[PDB]
Structure 1
Amino acid sequence: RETWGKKIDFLLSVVGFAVDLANVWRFPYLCYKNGGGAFLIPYTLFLIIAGMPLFYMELALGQYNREGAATVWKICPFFKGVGYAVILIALYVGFYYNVIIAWSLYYLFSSFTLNLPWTDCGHTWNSPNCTDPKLLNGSVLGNHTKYSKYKFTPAAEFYERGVLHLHESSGIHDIGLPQWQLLLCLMVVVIVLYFSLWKGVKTSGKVVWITATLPYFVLFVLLVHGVTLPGASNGINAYLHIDFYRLKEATVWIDAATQIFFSLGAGFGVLIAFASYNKFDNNCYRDALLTSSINCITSFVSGFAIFSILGYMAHEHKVNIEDVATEGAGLVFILYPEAISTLSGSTFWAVVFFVMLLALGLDSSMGGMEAVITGLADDFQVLKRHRKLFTFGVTFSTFLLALFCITKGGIYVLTLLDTFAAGTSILFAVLMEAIGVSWFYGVDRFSNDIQQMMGFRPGLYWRLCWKFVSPAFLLFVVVVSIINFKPLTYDDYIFPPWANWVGWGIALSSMVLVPIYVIYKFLSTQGSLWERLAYGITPENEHHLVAQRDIRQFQLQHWLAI
């Protein structure tokens, strides 16, 4: 196993994976559908929890076992099914991430013209629906159309007609055929990912140098414009308004936990592989703290700019903020182009913002795919040697499934699919991991490992969260998502029951595949039940200790100790 060349390499890698498509793509609409500040109060709180130990924990794991995402479960081989589930999780994440990168690449190719397509409502690649969308500049009176949701704006019409072509699909039942422009964009994306991940992990770290600088500045520029917008105050006041009646709803906490675990990287195995490639004496404490702080600041400024753009669009279109924009994965493609058009020289800023999105999305996707490849290679040593022949199959499967997900009705599937799996999967994933580090491997042996690694023992609060706080909160949010599940629905389209059935089917598929491997390891071991349990709950390198009638997990001190 090789390591990174310098600290800056994996530092900028984990930074670009922190400030990636995840935050700027999911936090805006997720905070928007939960009512601004009503989403901020739990999320941030949950943040610190799911930010401080767990991330750190994963890092320490990767720094101790020095294995892949699934192969680090050699201290407790029973709970290795989560290592195989996070692989499929990250695979789905890479699928819809590459779809989003293809969308952003199409936007970049379209924004090269001086007369930008989303500037007005005409036959300029926007594909107007029977001349229904009306420009704010052309209209000299109030909006007569129904204002429950505004899908007749230049940006939204260009997004849903010229890009996705959703008008040619009735729903998920009849999706259709993949668009050819999206097909070419996806081809370019998968080719870039392959040529970036075909040689090895040494390729990573060079491109991300342009990453750490480019989003922030652009985002900063948005803030420079954000306060200057005329109607931005109406969105800023709503973003900083705490709705306490919405904190009593389970959907807010579910979305907060999912967004945290999705943006931080916990539950995908990317952090595990990155720490496996890190040095043995690397300080995971400061890295985790800096990553959590950067994610918090980035999410805060992104939400601030998004609500400023929302207030501006509400003041322009004379609609309410609750209905001025649609809820879904396409919120940014509707909001940001308008704010760019407002600025002088909109072409340059649009190109810069789109290439920033492309860079961060490609970084996140290459990190996820590298994590998957590292896990499957450390699991199957045959795949570690055929580096250029194993990435090809993964990229081809990604290309096929993204073609399936870029149909006329793809936006109905992908998001839904994502959400469903992600939510359940991510929770279960970290839950399983926590349980191990809480109960089976132990919270004191993990602390001793961290002390051997970095020279100091973790704090008592960290161990309490590792053993009691974080696992209890994860079980709570799991039970909440199970009991208070709501039927998924798009902006206006309501999904049929079989779509939710397939989503829960994938969720239960992962949630049985973890105990599928549990039972597989239980049956593979030969001997009495006690001997099999001892072999399962003890590391492989200490399996001889099972033959010496010496087991620590059977002792009450192991479970009782903190």
Structure 2
Amino acid sequence: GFVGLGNVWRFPYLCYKNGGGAFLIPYFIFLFGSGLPVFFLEIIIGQYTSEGGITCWEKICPLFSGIGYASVVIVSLLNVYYIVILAWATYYLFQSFQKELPWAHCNHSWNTPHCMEDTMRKNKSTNFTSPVIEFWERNVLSLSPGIDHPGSLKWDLALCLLLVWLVCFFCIWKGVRSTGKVVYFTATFPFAMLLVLLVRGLTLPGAGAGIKFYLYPDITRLEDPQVWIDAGTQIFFSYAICLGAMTSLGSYNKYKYNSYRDCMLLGCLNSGTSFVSGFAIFSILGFMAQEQGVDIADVAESGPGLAFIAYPKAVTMMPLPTFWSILFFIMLLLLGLDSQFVEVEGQITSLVDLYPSFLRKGYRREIFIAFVCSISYLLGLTMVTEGGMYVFQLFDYYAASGVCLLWVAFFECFVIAWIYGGDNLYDGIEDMIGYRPGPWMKYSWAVITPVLCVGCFIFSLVKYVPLTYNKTYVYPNWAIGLGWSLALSSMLCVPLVIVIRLCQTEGPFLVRVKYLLTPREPNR
């Protein structure tokens, strides 16, 4: 279940946004420096404590327990916008049940008269747009001029959003497993369809330029600090780390269990599939580039939904457009639904034991399931509006990416490396997994991750570039302040809990900090 939408949507969009292969160098650097390190860190914390996200930190250190609450805020904010991605896929699937796909040609009402089939884009107001972009913006999104103009709500997406929310609600309400029936179909189908797209994508006449764009890096983009943050957060996003799910996932694992092999295996496949999937989508872009006579960096739309622009273009070029289009949206929806079933249930599982005596399992719990879904439905309803795409971009860049992931990832390593000690963790690890691992992990949590986290944070601050959508829309100042509020909401959690914890322990600050620094029953 390592495959998610991030690997097929977030990764391609981020890599496309950040030049070409210039994304890869920070991507693999962050992978081998922190990603697998912090992934194993959370997994082994879960195994050592056999406890949940917030509470395992309490076991490791009563102070700096705000990391757990920060994770809850991130997962909550993530679910609010992650579901809207599934809403688009569901709408596309519904539109893929018609004989001729709507985006195959642009002669319908919503298409701007300046549209022209990609086949004639080069064959024949110099700026000519494509049907695939038109359907996504003038039909699926009804893009408004700006975030300051919300406009009329699009009920089509709202209904699709309600459906996916209801599917998620019932699955959690009825304790339905994340993978339905046999896990194989839920597993091999994403691989099969991805390989179907890859074979089609590579075979495309323009795939050569796309792969060269995909792999050959640009050192100039490395100077811009945004690529380092995005690559670092990409890994943080795809592995679903710093959200408390992996700590819960490691909880179920037995004390005597070789989680090291699982983490490095599941870690490399999750990134490996993303890298392979990057070949397919970027191969499409090269084909679109030469067919349209437009540069690869400008042939697609640099906003979330690159998976909704290049991949539906491939299914159009597939032997049976309708057949393949339906299957793609099925696997796309499948990769998102299973993620939601696990990540949504994580916070309620985190919330139910967070505030007991009121959320007892049963009547109190069942209404809470709808309560979480409904409030998050109204909040997720904002992205449905015509200008809700821009709000979505703020949620993607800030709520569960950007500085927020770096800050929490830093404190996860900062606590374990110094307050708890990387050497002290190995003593449990060799007891648990049976053998003491090498020095790659210890020198990553203590040095590589803290250096990478702060350096990206600091260089971001001095070289501050405001967030832009489609590299052409400048956000208003208030929206950036609103966007930072989501990030500040999660990051402020750690310091806030520290102050509360210190107050609880009346006494000299030094005595109080030392008292609560002591780990409390780390393992049983």
Mapped to 2, the partners of 1:494 and 1:159 lie a distance apart of 21
Higher mean Cα deviation, 37-46 or 501-510? 501-510
Matched position secondary structure for 2:402: helix
Give 1:159's match in structure 2, choosing from 132, 136, 151. Answer: 136
Amino acid at match of 2:480: N
Farther off after superposition, 169-178 or 518-527? 169-178
**Does structure 2 retain, via aligned residues, the 8 Å contact 1:62–1:274?**
yes
Q: State the alpha-carbon separation in 1 of the partners of residues 48 and 367 from structure 2.
A: 29
- Structure 1 residue 205: deviation in Å? 4.1
Describe the superposition over 1:15-52 as per-residue Cα deviations: whole angstroms up to 9, x where unpaired. Answer: x2x21011111111211122221111221122112232
State the shift of 1:141 in Å. 4.2
Change (3 A) 1:66 1:380: farther
The one-letter amino acid paired with 1:517 is: V
Shift of 1:445: 2.5
What is the Cα-based RMSD across aligned positions, in Å?
Answer: 1.9
Counting aligned pairs with the same residue, the percent is: 46
Structure 1 residue 204 and structure 2 residue 185: aligned?
Answer: no
Structure 2 equivalent of residue 557 of structure 1: none
Alignment check: 8 A CA contact 2:154 2:386 kept: yes
The number of equivalent residue pairs is 515
- Whether 1:459 and 2:435 are equivalent positions in the alignment is no
Q: Deviations over 1:430-483 (max 9, x none)?
A: 111111111222222222222232222232221121222212221222222333
* 1:211–1:529 distance in 2 versus 1, CA, 3 Å: same
CA shift for structure 1 position 384:
5.6
What code does the residue aligned with 1:28 have?
A: P
1:468 paired residue among 441, 447, 463: 447
- Counting only pairs closer than 5 Å after superposition, residues 22-37 of structure 1 correspond to structure 2 as 22-37=6-21
2:95 equivalent in structure 1? 110
Name the SS for the 1:485 alignment partner: coil
CA apart distance, 1:256: 0.6
**2:422 maps to 1:443:** yes
Asked if structure 1 preserves the Cα contact closer than 8 Å seen for 2:206 and 2:289, the reply is yes
Displacement of 1:138 in angstroms is 5.3
TM-score, structure 2 as length reference: 0.94
1:104-253 to structure 2, matched below 5 A, reads 104-123=89-108, 127-129=110-112, 131-137=113-119, 141-142=123-124, 145-146=126-127, 152-166=129-143, 169-200=144-175, 203-206=177-180, 208-253=183-228
Q: Residue by residue, what CA displacement relative to the aligned partner does 1:165-187 show, whole Å, maximum 9, x if unpaired?
A: 11xx2311121343111111111
Q: Which one-letter code corresponds to 2:111 in the other structure?
A: P
Secondary structure of the corresponding residue to residue 469 of structure 1 = helix
Q: Which residue of 2 aligns with 1:364?
A: 339
Partners of 1:375 and 1:458 in 2: CA distance: 31
Q: Determine if the alignment matches structure 1 residue 405 to structure 2 residue 389.
A: no
C-alpha distance in 2 between matches for 1:247 and 1:139: 33
The alpha carbon displacement at 1:139 in A equals: 6.0
- The answer as to whether partners of 2:57 and 2:67 remain within 8 angstroms in 1 is no
Q: CA deviation at 1:137?
A: 3.9
Quick one: distance in 2 between partners of 1:457 and 1:532?
Answer: 34
Partners of 2:119 and 2:442 lie apart in 1 by 59
Out of 503, 507, 510, the position equivalent to 2:483 is 503
Q: Please tell me whether the aligned partners of residues 405 and 414 of structure 1 are also in contact (alpha carbons under 8 angstroms).
A: yes
Which residue number in structure 2 is paired with residue 95 of structure 1?
80
- Range 190-199 or range 382-391, more displaced: 382-391
Q: Which residue of 2 aligns with 1:45?
A: 29
Determine the C-alpha separation between the residues in 2 that align with 1:205 and 1:67: 23
Q: Tell me, in whole angstroms, the C-alpha distance in 1 between the residues paired with 2:484 and 2:35.
A: 27
Structure 1 residue runs without a partner (length 5+): 1-15, 543-562
**TM-score normalised to structure 1 length:** 0.88
Q: Is 2:260–2:433's contact at 8 Å kept on the other side of the alignment? A: no
Matched with 1:290 is: 265
Segment of structure 1 superposing worse, 376-385 or 156-165: 376-385
